[PDB]
Amino acid sequence: DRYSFSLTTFSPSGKLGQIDYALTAVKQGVTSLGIKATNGVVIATEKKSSSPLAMSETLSKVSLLTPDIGAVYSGMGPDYRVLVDKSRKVAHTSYKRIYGEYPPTKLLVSEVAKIMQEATQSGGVRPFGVSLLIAGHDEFNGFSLYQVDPSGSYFPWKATAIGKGSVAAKTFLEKRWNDELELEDAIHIALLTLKESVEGEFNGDTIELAIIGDENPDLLGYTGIPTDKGPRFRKLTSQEINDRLEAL
Amino acid sequence: GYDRALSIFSPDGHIFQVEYALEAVKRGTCAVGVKGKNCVVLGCERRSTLKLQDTRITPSKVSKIDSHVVLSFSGLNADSRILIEKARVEAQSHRLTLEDPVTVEYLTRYVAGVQQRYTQSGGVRPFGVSTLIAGFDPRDDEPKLYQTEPSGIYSSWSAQTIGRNSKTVREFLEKNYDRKEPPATVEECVKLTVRSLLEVVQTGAKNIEITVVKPDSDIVALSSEEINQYVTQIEQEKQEQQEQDKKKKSNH
Amino acid sequence: IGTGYDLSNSVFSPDGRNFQVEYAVKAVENGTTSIGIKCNDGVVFAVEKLITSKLLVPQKNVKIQVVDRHIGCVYSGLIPDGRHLVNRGREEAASFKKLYKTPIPIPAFADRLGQYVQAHTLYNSVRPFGVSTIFGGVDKNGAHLYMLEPSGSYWGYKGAATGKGRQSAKAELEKLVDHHPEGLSAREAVKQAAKIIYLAHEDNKEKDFELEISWCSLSETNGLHKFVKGDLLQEAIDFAQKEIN
Amino acid sequence: RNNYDGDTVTFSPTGRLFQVEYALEAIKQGSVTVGLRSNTHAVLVALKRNADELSSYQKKIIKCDEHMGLSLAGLAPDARVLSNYLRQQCNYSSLVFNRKLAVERAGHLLCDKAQKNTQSYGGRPYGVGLLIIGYDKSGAHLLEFQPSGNVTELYGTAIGARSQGAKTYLERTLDTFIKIDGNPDELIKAGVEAISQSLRDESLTVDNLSIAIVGKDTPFTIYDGEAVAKYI
Amino acid sequence: RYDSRTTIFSPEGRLYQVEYALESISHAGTAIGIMASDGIVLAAERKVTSTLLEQDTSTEKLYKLNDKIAVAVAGLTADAEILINTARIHAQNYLKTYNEDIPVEILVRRLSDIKQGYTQHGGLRPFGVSFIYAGYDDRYGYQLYTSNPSGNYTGWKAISVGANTSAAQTLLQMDYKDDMKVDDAIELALKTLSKTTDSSALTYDRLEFATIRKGANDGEVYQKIFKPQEIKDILVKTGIT
Amino acid sequence: SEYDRGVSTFSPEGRLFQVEYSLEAIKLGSTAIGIATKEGVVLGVEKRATSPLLESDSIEKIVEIDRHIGCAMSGLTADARSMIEHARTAAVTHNLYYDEDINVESLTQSVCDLALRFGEGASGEERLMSRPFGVALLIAGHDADDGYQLFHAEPSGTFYRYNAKAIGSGSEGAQAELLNEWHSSLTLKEAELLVLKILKQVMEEKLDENNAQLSCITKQDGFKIYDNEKTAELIKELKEKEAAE
Amino acid sequence: SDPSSINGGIVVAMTGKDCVAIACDLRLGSQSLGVSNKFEKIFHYGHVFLGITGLATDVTTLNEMFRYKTNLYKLKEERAIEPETFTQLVSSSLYERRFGPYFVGPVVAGINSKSGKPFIAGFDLIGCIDEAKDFIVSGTASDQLFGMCESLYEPNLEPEDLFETISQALLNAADRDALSGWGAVVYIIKKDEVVKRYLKMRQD
Amino acid sequence: SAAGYDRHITIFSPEGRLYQVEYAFKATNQTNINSLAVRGKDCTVVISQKKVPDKLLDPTTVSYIFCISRTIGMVVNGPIPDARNAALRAKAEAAEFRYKYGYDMPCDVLAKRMANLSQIYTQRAYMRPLGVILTFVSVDEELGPSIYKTDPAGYYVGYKATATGPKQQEITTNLENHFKKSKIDHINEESWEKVVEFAITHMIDALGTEFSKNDLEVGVATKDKFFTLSAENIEERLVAIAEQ
Predict the structure, then answer these.
(1) Rounded Cα–Cα distance for residues B139 and B124 (Å)
(2) Phi and psi angles of residue B77, each rounded to the nearest 5 degrees, phi first
(3) CA separation, residue H174 to residues G21, G135, H195 (Å)
(4) Which residues pair with E223 in a beta bridge?
(5) CA-atom Rg of chain F in angstroms
(6) CB-based contact B26 E13, cutoff 8 Å
(7) Euclidean distance between the first and final Cα of chain B, in Å?
(8) Spatial CB neighbours of B205, under 8 Å, sequence gap ≥ 6
(9) What whole-number distance in Å separates Cα of residue B107 and Cα of residue A247?
(10) What totals of helices (H) and strands (E) does chain C contain, helices first?
């Protein structure tokens, strides 16, 4: 009641009403999920066209924050875009002068968290409508995956999911997850889990699935340097998703 | 109501924030100030519950404002923290500008000024803390004892109890205290202060904190052994007096 | 009503309006009739300033006020509130002259005034405006007539009207489209303005009025705005009285 | 409803605000003053109030300049903020332009200043009426300033308690005082008659009269005691 | 009700807001720091868990703020992040300014002023967090304190916060041996953690632990957050596993 | 309702109720009386005693604002602290600028100018002091250009000059008695025994000096706050005078 | 010239083969007056060693400055700061002031643990990337040392070979400089072992 | 529900959403205007209705197609106040962008920065969302013909073609049939004039109402330019349809 007409006071059972509503706002979104393996990380989402005429191919819901780190969301569409904007800016500032190349995954998550936290702090501000997943790859902690909550807390995970179909996806991932998976194997889990959510439209035109694995000097835009590391992030096209989607 | 902000008084002339601040005082630990003629003994209840709880590193209930003026307090302990540091920085700053020792009358007046400024404003609330501030200056051998209030009022009292169950101690203090001759014995001033605080602690002399201020910048914190010495002498006299009263009855 | 929706200006109704902006329009209605008539070579502005007692001094209180020396503006609704939109308007006018060393085009002014009204609905701590403002002049492109709503909506007009007796005015303006498809020439429109305000004063009848007319005309006021006063105004008065009878 | 009895930033269904309306009330509980003018003079006559007979009575005439001046009827706190402002503008005109500020021109600055507080949600809105006199290049003028900010040029007007009889004196004798020019004596006498009728269940006394006069020949001067027991 | 701004007071002469922050602790995990002359242990319990949760290569309720002082968390985690970062910044100011490590009493004291400041000033929340501070300074040796969500500190030799504080406290003070040992701290903590927690078999992936010692590799203080397999060793001694 | 919550909301009187309530704060306060004569102004006060431990002779209630200016007060000391610190600066700043005494009337204006702040901001007055002042002062001094003048600085309006004025709890009965007992034939000494005569009547305690404190403004003497012995003596002369009549 | 030239002092770091040496003099002088015969110019944040030349104030002040930033880096990420990454940092941090630029010539040296490769880097007033796998020398006798180190360097050396090369280098170059010398100390980072060998040399 | 919720955009509902933003998606029915944007192969076309309902309004002052900058048109649907506010910021930012970055501001990038702008108005309770729908049309130099629609929420998504208004649906369904059967997302003809004929025909069938020259206003975006058509040019295209 008054514990989300105001942000000052709390429920006597803990937490603001605003946070529990912010999670409701997450589930009203598309379904996004990530699975970590020991030689890769898959990140996968669906995109609701929401008009036969809408082009969701022109805006994808998998967006590189920096070349080695992509992110997805589940939750409100407008809220995602500004939040992504601030991710690209802070990243250069915070570590592309400290290390002169793009940050650790781990670092950018602690930064993002402070921003989400500050909108839970005071009245006359609202939480963000999303929970994000940030996946990336660095050499200092290896492959990682994270879930970043609009409460202002963040949790690392091996595989997790969020969105409308989260509760179905989570039990599914528990069963099929093993101690060593391949990148290819984790893509083959990722398609099945998301297909539980939406069926009767599943194709790689409507489902976007992409990976964080090894460097691409092909998406780097240069070669001829013995130390160069191209984007750990990589987009599969519509055609490549179909090759994996047949493989099931 | 008129309790929605500090920009509204009630039609009696009261502001309910201040009135609930006065109930706040009563929540936290008790304090007694009692003046002599060469001393002021400023004593306070020390809260302990558990054995784990230290009395080494644990926050003292007497804070030294300077080397000749001290402050003990009553109210919320969390609230009183901001108030403690502020009063010490101001203490040093007087001496930076002027180059003079910290005047007691100035000191209470500024300190109650901090509280007043918040009360004057509506966007910030004052502390629910009332203090006792006792001292001497090197230029005075005539003792001063002051009080602040959560409103922004400063007052002078000969002798005072504030904080937890003040009321009963308050009447005991009146009778014994004489304005004729306040306790000239230093030991007897401490002993009175022990008798007053005795009432509110129940059993204790590791829960009685006595501290003593005398002129020309002498400050002491009295060890646990000395606080326990008072209790043995004070129980012997209270009991003795009681036995005698029942003998006056027997005689008639 | 309740449930917001008028209780703040940020909040929006499910209908597509804002009921706080509707009470501001009611305040324009309550104010005294003003008309503006666009012409194929000028603009004429007229206003009804009613006389409530004869303690007023005649030709000394008006709702006609000038901006530069060639943009006339006249306001209805809350009287000091219409003054203020002109006072800020005047500030906006000056800025443009200093920077570009040119007189302000009337559609340029038209953009700039309506940005002030709109700023006063983006904040719940700023009361909107509650005044309509008839305006226009002669510029580079010739003569133009505009009117601005307290919504923060505006459009160009051939004939414009606002205030309490605006029900008559609107009707006389229409007779004019048919009568003259040039909207009338600027000279004969000073007399047309007076006659209009007299039929409008039949809706205020229980009281007397004072009529002020001003104009700005391309070559019959020489690109400049000046007040219609003198033997000019009295001829306008005589035409009105005659044809009403 | 009267959900608008608290909001000064939110229109009332009539198109008013209630706050502006209450501000007219404040004037009614306020102290009476009668204005009037002629081409070559303008006069303010005002009633001093007292709470008892050990009070030495409230100044109702504030000298704004040596050629301009004002009187009040309503909230004295609000009257102070606007008096400060008003002197600041008249001195500004004498500093930069070596110029007297016109009565009418001053009034348009005061207008923006009323409506600023209406627009805002911060500080009190006004609740005092000022009767303003001056004598500039365009002779004596009389404005009635309202706490709305509406400024009205008349030949005579009145604000304050029981001010509807001053308007009735002035209406009848409207023309008598247009014809008198160059006689300060006559114009002063006319306000005094005026404010006897205005008042009800009161009588005038010597030290209840404060008459303030400026014209073309008369400097700005305030008459008290023996200088106003000649026109009672 | 009093709920609108923190610039108000309830009739207890406290604020209802402070009570609401209090309650925030008692729906989070349980936290225990036991001090001994030979080292201080910090322990926290995880309030989420899964088998696809990464918690074996990470901690979340244990931060070192400098290489001589460590903290445990009980409360919401969203509240925690902001104030940890500020304590750590204050430590490195101390290091920069005075050329030495901060005392325990100040570092806590600052943090306590800052919590109270959000009560004192504005309509901004109190931050419902209780932190256990276990530190070293060469003035009062080992020092164990905790900080209140109201924003005051009190010294200790053992304390529990979190969920079921009362239940935990009685159990800790019963088994407190008066010289104490870091090895007994470590042993006591697991036992006490078990009974509050709603699992009957406490486990190392469900555990966060740091032990602080200067009593081995003397003349210097070395603080060690334990790795998962070591936590398993100490569990086997207490007979839980 | 929405009238006692807000400093920017007027009620059907056209007033603030913030301003109203602050009068009742003064009536809470102890009785204080000032009586002007042409010999000097005499400022008397009441203090209270409910404890034998309360030292009431070691804190002030009559204060020196300059070297010929004194003030008595009633209401909260919190509201009084701000007011007197302010008023100290105004007199001091005057001696800087001109190298002359402050006049009595102008000191009154400054105190009522602080009083005006009840809220947060305003155009033509920055407000930083967010409540009504629940204190008044009687302001007494001497200028040479008039004489001795005695004023009441009102926190709720503008200032009213008096020849004798009572404030506080017992203000009501004191005011009637001063009309029938203030006269221009009454010397310095008579002025003292008058204040004590009224003072006791509305006191709920006996007439004694531990609950009283007189002072005078004599320019010749500078502002003099009295000793306890002088007041004690005078309680005795008061009773002997009235014993015999 | 600059203030860096008035106070002086030398820090020279060098590379061999899976090793580094970074060595310094013990002279601090403030102009003509010699001040300390024993102020070490070598400091460290983990395995990364920071030398500092220049004015005496900025030797102490920047040390506090870079300590602050490496301590927040260490705690958050739970690893040691790397010499590869510290070179980025030194150059931006000194560049923060440009309108009050710090008057120093640092030398960074360390060995990366994420490959074991040896790293040395050179800087100036506001610092720039200057990459070497040979040597970086700095100070008022830097022009002497640039040639002295090149002349004695033979590419690809043992940890024990590298001692000899940096010692003979420092020994004569410091001595035949006014504002340098007065003792020296040599740190040989073998890989992760650091042996400290004090040079017996004369008092300059 | 209603207990705070609808009265704010900083108070979430039990659904996690904002009722108040969603009520502006019901503000396009009040002005009663429809748009149609279609892309040809080398062009983009926008046609929106023009409402002149009174003979005291000139046809040339009432327009809803605005020149934002040289190659960028925009159609506005919905209320006249929020129409202006959006228009200003889009002109100030487009002009500023173009010389700062030296690039002609693409359809995606204008639609993007504005959608960002609309999100910022919603997070603070001081500001409010826009009510209008802006459908930006440009022929880009990096993507050729494009239509990006930005919603009063701060959603923006691309479109083959898009429509807006109260009768928006009926046009949507007509465009669905057209692109689906042909298996191209463009109007096949290459001349911008003949594309405008096709687009005008789809609208007259779909709404059921024949339009006039003073009941349309048409902007046509070509390769690196925009221009808005006058009524006599629009008439030529209308009669093109009417007589085969």
Answers:
(1) 38
(2) -80, -35
(3) 78, 75, 16
(4) E212
(5) 19
(6) yes
(7) 62
(8) B194, B224, B227, B228, B230, B231
(9) 83
(10) 6, 10
Rg of chain H over CA atoms, in angstroms? 18
Q: Identity (one letter) of the amino acid at C224? A: L
Beta strands in E106-152 (DSSP E): 129-137, 141-147
Cβ neighbours of residue B82 under 8 Å, at least 6 residues apart? Answer: B127, E113, E116, E117, E120
CA angle B21, B24, B30 (to 5 degrees): 125
Cis peptide bond N-terminal to C124, omega within 30: no
CB atoms near residue E233 (< 10 Å)? 11
Active site residue C221: no
Residues facing residue C43 across a β-bridge: C38, C216
All residues at 6 or more sequence positions from C192 whose CB lies less than 8 Å from its CB, including other chains = C37, C44, C172, C176, C184
Q: Which residues of C touch D (CB under 8 A)?
A: 6-9, 20, 23-24, 26-27, 29-30, 53-57, 60-61, 77-81, 83-84, 87, 120, 124-128, 130
Nearest alpha-carbon partner for G41 in G20, G63, G15, G65: G63
- Name the packing angle between helices D103-119 and C79-100 (round to 10°): 100
Query: How many CB atoms are closer than 10 A to CB A62?
Result: 18
Q: Which of C32, C33, C162, C221 is catalytic?
A: C32
Question: Is E42 in contact with E188 (CB distance < 8 Å)?
Answer: no
Angle between the N-to-C axes of helices B166-176 and B186-201, in degrees from 0 to 180, rounded to the nearest 10: 150
Sort residue C230 into left (φ over 0), alpha (ψ -120 to 50) or beta: left
Return the ∠ at Cα C113 (arms to C107 and C117), rounded to 5°. 140
Separation between Cα atoms, residue F85 and residue F101, nearest integer Å: 18
* Separation between Cα atoms, residue E151 and residue E165, nearest integer Å: 18
Q: Do residues B164 and B26 lie in contact, with contact meaning Cβ atoms separated by under 8 Å?
A: yes
Tell me which chain E residues have a C-beta less than 8 angstroms from the C-beta of A11. Answer: 20
G77 lies within 8 A of chain E by CB: no
Domains and CATH numbers, chain G: 1-204 (3.60.20.10)
Token pair for residue C67?
Answer: 């901006």
Contact E74, E44 (CB under 8 A): yes
Calpha distance D143→D68 (Å, rounded): 12
Judged by a CB distance cut-off of 8 A, whether residue C173 touches chain H is yes
Contact C57 D153 (CB under 8 A): yes
Nearest-CA distance from E236 to chain B in Å? Answer: 28
Closest by Cα among D142, D192, D182 to D35 = D142
β-partners of residue D163 are: none
Q: Are C47 and C212 in contact (CB under 8 A)?
A: yes
H108 Cβ contact list (under 8 Å, min separation 6): A58, H140, H143, H146, H148, H158
Nearest to residue C194, comparing CAs of C164, C237, C160?
A: C237
Residues with Cβ within 8 Å of residue B240, at least 6 apart in sequence? none
> What are the φ and ψ backbone dihedral angles of H224, each rounded to 5 degrees?
65, 40
At residue D155, what is the residue type? Y
Q: Facing residues of F46 across strands? A: F212
Method by which the model was determined: cryo-EM
Q: What SS3 class is residue B107?
A: helix
Contact A30, H25 (CB under 8 A): no
Which residues of A are less than 8 Å from H122 in CB distance?
78
Number of H helices, E strands in chain B: 6, 10
Question: F168 phi and psi, to 5 degrees?
Answer: 100, -160
Q: Provide the token pair at G148.
A: 């002295």
Cβ–Cβ < 8 Å for D166, D194: yes
What do you get for the CA distance between the two ends of chain E, in Å? 50
Helix H or strand E encompassing D171: helix D164-172
Q: What are phi and psi of C85, to 5 degrees?
A: -70, -30
B-chain residue closest to E121, CA distance: B124
CA distances from H135 to D27, H131, H213 (A): 55, 13, 22
